[PDB]
Amino acid sequence: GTMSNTGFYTHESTFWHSTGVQALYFPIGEWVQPPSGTYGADTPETKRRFLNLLRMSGLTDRLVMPAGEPVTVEDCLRIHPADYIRRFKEASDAGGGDLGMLAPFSKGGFEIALMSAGLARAAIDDVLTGKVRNAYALSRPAGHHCLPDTPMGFCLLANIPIAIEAARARHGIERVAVVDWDVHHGNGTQACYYDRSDVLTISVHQDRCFPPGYSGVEERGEGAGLGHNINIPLPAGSGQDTYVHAFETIVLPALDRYRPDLIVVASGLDANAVDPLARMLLFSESYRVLTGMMMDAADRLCEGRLAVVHEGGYSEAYVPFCGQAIVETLAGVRTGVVDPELEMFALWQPGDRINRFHRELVDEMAAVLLG
Amino acid sequence: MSNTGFYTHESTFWHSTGVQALYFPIGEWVQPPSGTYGADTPETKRRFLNLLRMSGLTDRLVMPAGEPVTVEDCLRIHPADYIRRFKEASDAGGGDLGMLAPFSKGGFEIALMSAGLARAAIDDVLTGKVRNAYALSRPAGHHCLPDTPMGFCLLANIPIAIEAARARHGIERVAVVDWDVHHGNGTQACYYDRSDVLTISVHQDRCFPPGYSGVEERGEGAGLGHNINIPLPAGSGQDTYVHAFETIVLPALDRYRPDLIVVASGLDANAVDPLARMLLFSESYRVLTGMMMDAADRLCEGRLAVVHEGGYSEAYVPFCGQAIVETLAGVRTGVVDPELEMFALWQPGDRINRFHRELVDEMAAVLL
Amino acid sequence: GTMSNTGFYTHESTFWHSTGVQALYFPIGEWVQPPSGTYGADTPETKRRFLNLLRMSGLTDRLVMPAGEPVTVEDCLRIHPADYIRRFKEASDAGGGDLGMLAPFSKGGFEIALMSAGLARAAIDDVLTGKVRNAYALSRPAGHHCLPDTPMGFCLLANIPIAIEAARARHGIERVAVVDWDVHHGNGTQACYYDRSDVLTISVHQDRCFPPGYSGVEERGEGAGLGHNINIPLPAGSGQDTYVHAFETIVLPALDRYRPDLIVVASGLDANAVDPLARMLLFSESYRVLTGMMMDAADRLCEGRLAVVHEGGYSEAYVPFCGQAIVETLAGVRTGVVDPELEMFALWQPGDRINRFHRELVDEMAAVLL
Amino acid sequence: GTMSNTGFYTHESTFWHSTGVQALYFPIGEWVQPPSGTYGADTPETKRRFLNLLRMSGLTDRLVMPAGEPVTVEDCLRIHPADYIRRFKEASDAGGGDLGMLAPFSKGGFEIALMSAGLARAAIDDVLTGKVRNAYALSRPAGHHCLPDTPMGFCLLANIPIAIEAARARHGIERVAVVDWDVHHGNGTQACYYDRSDVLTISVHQDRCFPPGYSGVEERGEGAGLGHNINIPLPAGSGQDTYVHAFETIVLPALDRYRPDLIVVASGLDANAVDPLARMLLFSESYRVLTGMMMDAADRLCEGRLAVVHEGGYSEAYVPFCGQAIVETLAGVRTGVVDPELEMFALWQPGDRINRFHRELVDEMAAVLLG
Ligand SMILES: OC[C@H]1O[C@@H](O)[C@H](O)[C@@H](O)[C@@H]1O
Ligand SMILES: OC[C@H]1O[C@@H](O)[C@H](O)[C@@H](O)[C@@H]1O
Ligand SMILES: OC[C@H]1O[C@@H](O)[C@H](O)[C@@H](O)[C@@H]1O
Ligand SMILES: [K+]
Ligand SMILES: [K+]
Ligand SMILES: [K+]
Ligand SMILES: [K+]
Ligand SMILES: [Zn+2]
Ligand SMILES: [Zn+2]
Ligand SMILES: [Zn+2]
Ligand SMILES: [Zn+2]
């Protein structure tokens, strides 16, 4: 019982990153009144409360929890140009700033970003060397929107690509699949590997949400990357049925065709049923099913090698239950935690008429993407 | 001076639901919140009023001093036992006498004031002191059953206000159009067997009450045909809402011929609300308010009273509320909604909208 | 009866000024963790809750509440150099900043600072023209630490000096007294008039608090201003007895000798018993006493002309009861408001031994200053 | 580098205790408006931020940090009557309550109180068995105002007395000294041992603060406890000089005469210079001095056996720097932490004239209490 083979990678400094004073994500000034209680959208508590519940549940006693270690600037330069890293560190040493679109940070945010990327790097490395069978990295700030030279949407470094390239330099790995179930499009991961065949990048996201107006079915890669990028925009208001169907008919077959040597999941929990930053209806049970599917795929394709890296998630109240369910599934253990909304959110799921239409939309995309 | 009344009182912001994480009670697995506590926080309503003041619009609004309803007003809807137990709990430490309707010490008096804002707004529209009105009621009312508070609602604000107007003025027909994203089960129950109020609810399918749709609940006895439930799919945007108003709500009002239109205006269908999955934004509420004003112009001499219900985004509710009041008053301000472009880009695609329109068209045929 | 002759000057935009993300007033960074919940020290709620209680009490029905109007850049230039105003406006048009010592502000803070100063200007003007007998201006951001060229300690413009100089240009008023009972030293007001006899500046403050380490008894002005500045540093831990003694034996006699044509109170409420930014023991009853004393002085010396301008106060929970008590005293009415801490904060007051010693310290200052 | 002999005892559940909605400590109601941001006075963050800074500082890598274990009902009954324990458990199983004066708690507060007391019990036990040389227990809820029959002032169980009596039953310890430097009077500790000679209870506190109006110099015990209780009320506005003089002239000589076999410090951090709940002027350097004096006393009198148990402290911004200073002193190490208020809070200290008068008051008390 005792110790599982699942690693959980976290460091206190990830909770010290601050985006500044916003009302939700709206900058103050003009017509947006400063907030009185919670400021910001990516608040530390939207990630800390997940860790706190994990500790209260007792699960941490059964997890491998290594000390966090930051990436180096050299690790960053495998993805980002030296000019971006210089200006980022320069602003961080002053009073912070925002070098992209909706990517604010405070004094010292550079070092925290290095630690966050280091949690992902260590999780992927420890899975590859067999120190653990699978892993969850509680990275904050997130990574999947960060382009090589432009931070975006709360993401300051390209966490997953940095971790993959660091692993390639130290281990060599023939093919990697990144499955992004954060509710927003993983435009950063897509851009980092768009012209390459050695990473299959898959994103399931709310149609048109972030980047705003973007769907992306027709963006399949270019050059050697043609056919190695898969975008699955789902309608707002999709629930577990739609997500499970997209995984069954698109994600899983795409992974079987590609035969990766490692599966990385970009795990945003912002598709949850009460998140302010999207319109989806997933709940804790949904994340159990999706995690189980990814574990099954990793078991069949790459000896169970599955690394899960946190991205978004904006409900302080409900994100902890979804994260708890993921880690429980990775570790193969249940706890005494009771999700208080388990039945309510099941009753909120769309009816059969809506689910049938959403499946038809998914089937149409599966024909376009897999044939 | 505009001819639009805005009814608000400071005490409505002093009602508190207690410590919850969102709406989850704290306990073994729900950690107490660190920043904002609760879901119906005072700021989800005060920030609307604050923006109205910053915009200058309050200088052109009629803003009477709030006056609470009396126990006699409450007893037209609620049994004396409920009102007694409510007052007794409020005089102690508060409590929760229903399902998800917590309140603190003194919450009874605040609920009387909240209902009084709705009573005054409706009365002032009926007597013509103002052409239309917005009542910033908190706590909300549209989930409150005659003997059971529910879903943040402690008294049946709109029904108390209608029955108070009837007791002085005698009104033959009133229509209540509820665009709060949750089903107005309280309004529905107060008038379910009556023809003198047409109750219409547009709500997210299955949301609150959880799993409830309600198309088939069309009234009973003398009220048969006088209740209309319009469940819309989660993820519906402006196109779907406007179509449901064009094809169901407005035709239903035309047939019924109300002497007064009351809108139960929750702002929780907004695109970033935590408590629903809809995609309305400030421009959507301008369109819907314009449609209700045009209906009131055609049917009842512009008599339109708008009573606040839900809305849970502290950041974004103010811009939606501002847009409604600007539309009621017929004046624009310098306020620019910073999310106008983004929330337009978020709207559903044509394929989704076409399917949602088919679903609305099917209900329109059934609902006559 | 019906309406009073007391004005209350407030504008919604004053609550929209933000100092940014700080833990209390500490900047976030390597060792100061970002706060969860309340960020900053000068939070909007430390002033808005005062107004909210005033509304709940019903007192606003009987107060004159004119619409707020800002001061102009021209009004500011009577005190501040154009270079400061230009750099302040420049930073405010971008993303905010901090041009001094512990004076952060956000985008648009310049226009809000103009409105805050405008509340003080209008309050003083309306008292002078007789529109109201007395007034309270809920200014935020505060003003009494702002030097002519350097903002400091949450103060971005010199509210009271700008208001006084505007009243001079408009009405030619000759002698004004400023009595500053904010718990911190009014170094800005002192600096603005240090060489001038047409304003008597008096500050009662916690010894060494803000500016840190400053006491100031011997700084009594210069030139024509010699004898027209009075600093009364009181020990940390002083309560109502000590404050009342300093007012009876120093403040009131100084006003009698100066013969002002207007009394302005710089009213910070941060000497209250639970404030985080000072160590004093005043409570709502204390502010009734001090306000009555200032009203008595104004009644004797300048026909009741008394304008009260808000400065500091950092207890969201308790500042409202102190502000309410001041405004009730100014209007000569009582309300149904019950201060829940009256019994406890009276029990917290220092014992006789300490009060005796504090009185001796006050007596020594009085012998020097008078 | 390597491990210190200092224990730090904390459990996640102590941060889940909630006092409910109060503005500061004022109950909400007709004239106290509900708070917007921070609710309550004893907020979880007033203790968690101390732990968070300890982790950031790297000091935790060199501290012994055992898993928290709660006390049992048997342990509580050594101090509290069965009727109180029964009623406390009953209210906790429902929806919480307040069984005393200013001691609210929420559902499940009973189990959390048992854990909080357990942190103190284990700290004292491990100091006594030699598992660590000294220890800090981050107890929350606090204990030192709790009377045997009546909770008070945020304290639900008598943490320190429960811990001492548990140590007596298991180890037979003969004499213990409790030195309470929380800014409020330790009326709970005083009551628990008032007629006993086997605990010397010393409290340094702001005169008249809490319980309100209480000074207490003349309350020196009864029966076998005569001369074994020492109250040192200091004036509001006292700073480091006054506190240090009180320790040099009263606390340290009292410990030398009593010859304890263990020293327990009831460590509230609410004498700090920005605390809302008192009027004192201590800062992080002051707590280094006071902790060093207690360590020197323990070194001379009881083989270094010193257990420090958290009580109050209500500045979220500043309490962490004071707690960090104490633990660094116990462990005998420095870190990279920079207290940002060192220069300002030194400038705030009282002038010579006040310090001389406060010293005279202290001298008069030493003449009554020790001679
Ligand atoms: O359909 C059942 C119906 O029963 C009636 O008694 C309630 O008042 C209605 O609101 C409800 O919908
Ligand atoms: O007066 C304003 C000043 O008050 C002092 O007590 C605080 O330490 C400073 O941070 C603040 O700026
Ligand atoms: O404070 C502890 C003691 O205080 C004394 O005044 C009481 O008489 C004692 O019974 C009590 O235990
Ligand atoms: K995605
Ligand atoms: K509805
Ligand atoms: K002063
Ligand atoms: K003490
Ligand atoms: Zn996301
Ligand atoms: Zn609603
Ligand atoms: Zn001050
Ligand atoms: Zn204390």
| Burial C155-173, CB ≥16 within 10 A → b, else e | bbbbbbbbbbbbbeeeeeb
**Are the beta carbons of C57 and C336 closer than 8 angstroms?**
yes
- Is residue C38 within 8 angstroms of chain A, CB to CB? yes
| CA dist., res. C209 & res. C214, Å (int) | 7
Instruction: State the catalytic residue, choosing from A80, A145, A228, A358.
Output: A145
- R_g (Cα) of chain D, nearest Å: 19
- R_g (Cα) of chain A, nearest Å: 19
**Are the beta carbons of C196 and C176 closer than 8 angstroms?**
no
Q: How far is CA D137 from the centre of its chain?
A: 10
Q: Count of residues for chain C?
A: 370
| CA dist., res. A341 & res. A318, Å (int) | 9
> Cβ atoms within 10 A of the Cβ of B216, count?
7
| Cα atoms in the 13 Å half-sphere on the side-chain side of C68 | 27
The strand pairing partners of A266, in sequence order, are A180, A309
**Are the beta carbons of A182 and A268 closer than 8 angstroms?**
yes
Instruction: State the catalytic residue, choosing from C11, C80, C144, C145.
Output: C145
Q: Which of these, B134, B8, B5, B133, lies nearest to B62 by C-alpha position?
A: B5
For residue A141, cis peptide bond before it (omega within 30 degrees of 0): yes
| CA dist., res. C200 & res. C213, Å (int) | 23
Residue A146 lies in a domain: yes
Angle at the Cα of C308 from the Cα atoms of C306 and C312, rounded to 5 degrees: 160
| CA dist., res. B122 & res. B135, Å (int) | 9
- Is residue C1 within 8 angstroms of chain D, CB to CB? no
What is the end-to-end Cα distance of chain A in Å, rounded? 45
User: The domain that contains D225 carries what CATH number?
Assistant: 3.40.800.20
Judged by its nearest atom, the ligand closest to the C-alpha of residue A216 is 4
Copy the structure tokens of residue B50: 């604050």
Distances (CA, A) of A128 to A122, A306, A307, D336: 10, 9, 9, 35
**Are the beta carbons of B82 and B156 closer than 8 angstroms?**
no
Residue C34 lies in a domain: no
| Structural domain harbouring C166 | 6-29+39-369
Determine the 3-state secondary structure of A310 from DSSP. strand
Q: Are C33 and D281 inside 8 Å of each other by CB?
A: no
> Cβ atoms within 10 A of the Cβ of D203, count?
25
Residue D214 lies in a domain: yes
The strand pairing partners of C4, in sequence order, are none
C-alpha torsion B53→B59→B60→B61, nearest 10? 60
For residue A35, cis peptide bond before it (omega within 30 degrees of 0): no
DSSP classification of residue A247: I
C-alpha torsion C27→C31→C37→C40, nearest 10? -20
| CA dist., res. B77 & res. B112, Å (int) | 13
**Are the beta carbons of D38 and D316 closer than 8 angstroms?**
yes
Determine the 3-state secondary structure of C13 from DSSP. helix
Copy the structure tokens of residue D227: 């001369």
| Experimental determination approach used | X-ray
Q: Which of these, C227, C326, C214, C314, lies nearest to C274 by C-alpha position?
A: C314
Helices (H) and strands (E) in chain B, counts: 12, 11
Output the DSSP codes for C349-360.
S--HHHHHHHHH
- Is residue A43 within 8 angstroms of chain C, CB to CB? yes
Packed helices B282-300 and B317-329: angle between N→C axes, nearest 10 degrees: 30
Q: Tokens 């399902």 map to which residue?
A: B99
Position B72, amino acid: E
CA distance C125 to chain D (A): 33
Q: Which residues of D are catalytic?
A: 145
**Are the beta carbons of B182 and B212 closer than 8 angstroms?**
no
For residue C154 and ligand 2, the question of a CB distance below 6 A is answered with: yes
Angle at the Cα of A114 from the Cα atoms of A52 and A121, rounded to 5 degrees: 80
Angle at the Cα of D58 from the Cα atoms of D56 and D61, rounded to 5 degrees: 130
| CA dist., res. C178 & res. D121, Å (int) | 58
Contacts of A108 in chain C (CB under 8 A): 29-30
DSSP classification of residue B247: I
**Are the beta carbons of B51 and A347 closer than 8 angstroms?**
no
Angle at the Cα of A126 from the Cα atoms of A124 and A132, rounded to 5 degrees: 115
Q: Are C15 and B50 inside 8 Å of each other by CB?
A: yes
Q: Which of these, B161, B160, B167, B226, lies nearest to B195 by C-alpha position?
A: B226
Copy the structure tokens of residue B107: 């919450």
Determine the 3-state secondary structure of C153 from DSSP. coil
Angle at the Cα of D81 from the Cα atoms of D77 and D82, rounded to 5 degrees: 80
Surface of D (60-99) touching C: CB under 8 A: none
Distances (CA, A) of C122 to B367, C16, C51, C116, C335: 61, 20, 18, 10, 26
H or E, element range at C105: strand C104-105
Distances (CA, A) of A253 to A180, A297, D356: 15, 10, 83
Which parts of chain A are beta strand (E)? 6-9, 22-23, 26-27, 96-98, 104-106, 134-137, 176-180, 199-206, 229-234, 262-267, 306-310
Contacts of D335 in chain A (CB under 8 A): none
Copy the structure tokens of residue A309: 């890296």
**Are the beta carbons of A314 and A46 closer than 8 angstroms?**
yes
Which atom of ligand 1 is nearest the CA belonging to B145?
8
Q: Are B14 and D21 inside 8 Å of each other by CB?
A: no
For residue D284, report the distance from its CA to the centre of ligand 11, in Å: 17
| CA dist., res. C35 & res. C28, Å (int) | 9
For residue D191 and ligand 3, the question of a CB distance below 6 A is answered with: yes
| CA dist., res. A29 & res. C17, Å (int) | 9
**Are the beta carbons of D42 and D141 closer than 8 angstroms?**
yes
Packed helices C319-331 and C284-302: angle between N→C axes, nearest 10 degrees: 30
Residue B350: closest C-alpha in chain A = A235
Residue D41 lies in a domain: no
- Is residue C243 within 8 angstroms of chain B, CB to CB? no
| CA dist., res. D122 & res. D310, Å (int) | 13
The strand pairing partners of D172, in sequence order, are none
What's the burial of C72, exposed, middle or buried (CB within 10 Å: 0-12/13-18/19+)?
Answer: middle
DSSP classification of residue D1: -
DSSP classification of residue C71: P
Q: Which of these, D164, D177, D42, lies nearest to D98 by C-alpha position?
A: D42
H or E, element range at A77: helix A73-77
- The set of chains that have 3 or more CB pairs under 8 A with C is A, B, D
Position D115, amino acid: M
> Which runs of consecutive H residues, i.e. helices, occur in chain C?
45-57, 73-77, 82-93, 109-128, 159-171, 187-192, 240-246, 252-258, 284-302, 319-331, 342-347, 352-369
| CA dist., res. D180 & res. D230, Å (int) | 10
Q: How far is CA A358 from the centre of its chain?
A: 23
Q: Which residues of B are catalytic?
A: 143
**Are the beta carbons of B303 and B295 closer than 8 angstroms?**
no
Resolution limit in angstroms? 1.5
Residue A312, C-beta contacts closer than 8 angstroms, at least 6 positions apart: A42, A142, A154, A182, A183, A184, A268, A269, A270, A277
| CA dist., res. B141 & res. B232, Å (int) | 21
Contacts of C52 in chain B (CB under 8 A): 10, 13
What's the burial of D147, exposed, middle or buried (CB within 10 Å: 0-12/13-18/19+)?
Answer: buried
The strand pairing partners of A8, in sequence order, are A136
> Which runs of consecutive H residues, i.e. helices, occur in D96-239?
109-129, 159-171, 187-192
H or E, element range at A114: helix A109-128
Sign of the Cα pseudo-torsion (B350, B353, B358, B364, in order): negative
- Is residue C36 within 8 angstroms of chain A, CB to CB? yes
Packed helices B157-169 and B107-127: angle between N→C axes, nearest 10 degrees: 50
| CA dist., res. A132 & res. A306, Å (int) | 10
| CA dist., res. A219 & res. C145, Å (int) | 59
Interface test with D, best of B37, B96, B314 (most D CBs within 10 A): B37
For residue A156, report the distance from its CA to the centre of ligand 6, in Å: 46
Q: How far is CA B305 from the centre of its chain?
A: 11
- Is residue D21 within 8 angstroms of chain B, CB to CB? yes
Ligand 6 being an ion, which residues bring their Cβ within 5 A of it? C 180, 182, 186, 203, 205
Copy the structure tokens of residue A119: 């949690």
Distances (CA, A) of B265 to A32, B237, B249, D91: 22, 17, 15, 40
Q: Which of these, A228, A227, A156, A216, lies nearest to A184 by C-alpha position?
A: A216
Copy the structure tokens of residue A159: 């966490």
| CA dist., res. B223 & res. B177, Å (int) | 16
Q: Are D15 and A52 inside 8 Å of each other by CB?
A: yes
Pocket test for ligand 3, best of D194, D203, D222, D230 (most atoms within 8 A of CB): D194
Supply φ then ψ for residue D22, to 5 degrees: -135, 150
Supply φ then ψ for residue D320, to 5 degrees: -60, -35
Which parts of B217-279 are beta strand (E)? 227-232, 260-265
Copy the structure tokens of residue A280: 């989806």
Pairing, β D26-27 against β D22-23: antiparallel
Q: Are B22 and A316 inside 8 Å of each other by CB?
A: yes
> Cβ atoms within 10 A of the Cβ of D125, count?
18
Output the DSSP codes for B87-142.
HHHHHTTEE-SSBS--EETTHHHHHHHHHHHHHHHHHHHHHTSSSEEEE--SSB-T
Distances (CA, A) of D244 to D216, D241, D295: 20, 5, 14
**Are the beta carbons of B64 and B155 closer than 8 angstroms?**
no
H or E, element range at C179: strand C176-180
For residue C211, cis peptide bond before it (omega within 30 degrees of 0): yes
Supply φ then ψ for residue C335, to 5 degrees: -125, -175
Position C24, amino acid: L
Supply φ then ψ for residue C14, to 5 degrees: -60, -25
Clarify whether C185 is annotated catalytic: no
Sign of the Cα pseudo-torsion (A187, A278, A15, D340, in order): positive
Q: Tokens 């207007």 map to which residue?
A: C262
**Are the beta carbons of B264 and B158 closer than 8 angstroms?**
yes
Q: How far is CA B171 from the centre of its chain?
A: 21
Which parts of chain B are beta strand (E)? 4-7, 20-21, 24-25, 94-95, 103-104, 132-135, 174-178, 197-204, 227-232, 260-265, 304-308
> Cβ atoms within 10 A of the Cβ of A78, count?
16
| CA dist., res. D358 & res. D246, Å (int) | 10
The strand pairing partners of C262, in sequence order, are C176
Domain count, chain D: 1
| CA dist., res. A121 & res. A119, Å (int) | 6
Determine the 3-state secondary structure of A368 from DSSP. helix
Q: How far is CA B317 from the centre of its chain?
A: 13
> Which runs of consecutive H residues, i.e. helices, occur in D67-195?
73-77, 82-93, 109-129, 159-171, 187-192
Pairing, β D104-105 against β D97-98: antiparallel
Output the DSSP codes for C291-343.
HHHHHHHHHHHHTT-EEEEE-----TTTHHHHHHHHHHHHHT---S---TTHH
Residue D91 lies in a domain: yes
Does C182 belong to an annotated binding site?
Answer: yes
